Structure 1
Amino acid sequence: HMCDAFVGTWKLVSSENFDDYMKEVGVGFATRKVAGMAKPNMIISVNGDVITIKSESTFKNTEISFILGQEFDEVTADDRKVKSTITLDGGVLVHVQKWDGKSTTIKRKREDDKLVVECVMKGVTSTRVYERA
């Protein structure tokens, strides 16, 4: 029942500061431009202890399946190979990605009828808001 309120089909409706976040992560110019245009659909589902997050866009399709607290390998939309751990902190999904000595955190929370995503790289944050599709 853990993540029930996250389950569903979500579509991006707003983004703020995403180019600067991507720059801070180390994403190159061309990928930033094309990734920044995308309006992804994110499909979140749960089956037993396994959570699946799929993202579909004109840029890239991604899929991760995981168990809370259990590290896994992830290939990100910008083709980083990272080690990821996702936990729940007070109702917020907290997703840490580690690679090349670096780390970034993606937080996902329900707020009103939205799914709010905050991407943090050091001092740089981006907020991405999704609504039900």
Structure 2
Amino acid sequence: PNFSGNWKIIRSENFEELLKVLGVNVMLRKIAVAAASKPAVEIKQEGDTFYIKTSTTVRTTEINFKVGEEFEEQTVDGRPCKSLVKWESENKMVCEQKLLKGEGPKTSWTRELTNDGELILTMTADDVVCTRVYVRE
């Protein structure tokens, strides 16, 4: 699979609900939800090596990882974590996250390329799942 490209969002479900489970307060949620509705996403893939940049007016994240090798990033609400990505299937990667310090909901994320050429991102916090769908610009 080739995840490479500049992606634009076409659907977002359950984002605020995910933030609620993570403990983000009402006003911060309001800010986050508005900014997250129009992200600029850039993915560069070279084999099993990935670079993913997600940008919004209030927060930009850039992660670099190799599938199967542990790395450090942050949860959606901004807490440091150790992550490990694996191929669940040929077109789907799954990432398990572990908080470096403290306790909180168990979080994870998955990215998959669908048969129609789109990209589905899921983010999980305990039992709440956020689903976002993108298409290349």
Alignment correspondent of 1:51: 50
Alignment correspondent of 1:92: 92
Amino acid at match of 1:119: M
Aligned 8 A contact 2:22 2:77 in 1: no
Task: Give the gaps of 5 or more residues in structure 2.
Answer: none
Alignment correspondent of 1:109: 112
Residue 35 (1) aligns with residue 32 (2): yes
Aligned 8 A contact 1:75 1:81 in 2: yes
Q: Percent identity?
A: 38
C-alpha separation between the residues in 1 aligned to 2:24 and 2:82? 17
Alignment TM-score, normalising by the size of structure 2: 0.84
CA gap of 1:27–1:89, structure 2 versus 1, over 3 A, is same
C-alpha separation between the residues in 1 aligned to 2:117 and 2:45? 19
Shift of 1:56: 1.2
How large is the RMSD of aligned CA atoms in angstroms?
1.8
CA gap of 1:28–1:16, structure 2 versus 1, over 3 A, is same
Count residues in correspondence.
130
Amino acid at match of 1:7: S
Alignment TM-score, normalising by the size of structure 1: 0.86
Amino acid at match of 1:54: K
Shift of 1:60: 0.9
Alignment correspondent of 1:19: 16
C-alpha separation between the residues in 2 aligned to 1:95 and 1:27? 22
